[PDB]
């Protein structure tokens, strides 16, 4: 069950696309189409939050030292070498790189392919 997730990247949507890119001697524009190049098997452990297996090591990133009091719902983050989408507005220090509408849609074993979209969408 492929699920094409449309996400705006960086700017207000992705507060940490510069850090993610920075850390890995890369550009925000390079980070986007690396992430979008991916093919992600959805998994979970222990939530109902859709962890996404398959991310490129070239865009790995450490979790923000101090947690945010609230990541917005629909955010799209990277923690370590794990990517994934936020169904509801939780707190956490995942490096936020983008945002979709509007997810439970993703269930264990699904396949996620992110596609960019304009701010105007």
Swiss-Prot record:
One BP annotation, GO: sporulation resulting in formation of a cellular spore
EC number, as in UniProt: 3.5.2.9
Molecular functions (GO terms): 5-oxoprolinase (ATP-hydrolyzing) activity; ATP binding; protein kinase inhibitor activity
The protein's name: 5-oxoprolinase subunit B
Family: Belongs to the PxpB family.
Function noted in UniProt: Catalyzes the cleavage of 5-oxoproline to form L-glutamate coupled to the hydrolysis of ATP to ADP and inorganic phosphate. In addition, is a potent inhibitor of the autophosphorylation reaction of kinase A (kinA) and its reverse reaction, but does not inhibit phosphate transfer to the Spo0F response regulator once kinase A is phosphorylated. Is an inhibitor of the catalytic domain of kinase A affecting the ATP/ADP reactions and not the phosphotransferase functions of this domain. The inhibition is non-competitive with respect to ATP.
Organism for this UniProt entry: Bacillus subtilis (strain 168)
Residues engaged in binding ATP: 93-100
């Amino acid at each position: 069950r492929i699920v094409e997730i449309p996400v705006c990247y960086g700017g207000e949507f992705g507060p940490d696309l510069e850090e993610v890119a920075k850390i890995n001697q890369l550009s925000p524009e390079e980070v986007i189409d690396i992430h979008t190049n991916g093919e992600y098997v959805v998994y979970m452990l222990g939530p109902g939050f859709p962890f996404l297996g398959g991310m490129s090591k070239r865009i790995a990133a450490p979790r923000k030292s101090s947690p945010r009091p609230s990541i917005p719902a629909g955010s799209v983050g990277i923690a370590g070498l794990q990517t994934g989408v936020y169904p509801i507005s939780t707190p956490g220090g995942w490096q936020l790189i983008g945002k979709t509408p509007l997810a439970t849609l993703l269930r264990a074993g699904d396949i996620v392919k992110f596609v960019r979209i304009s701010e105007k969408d």
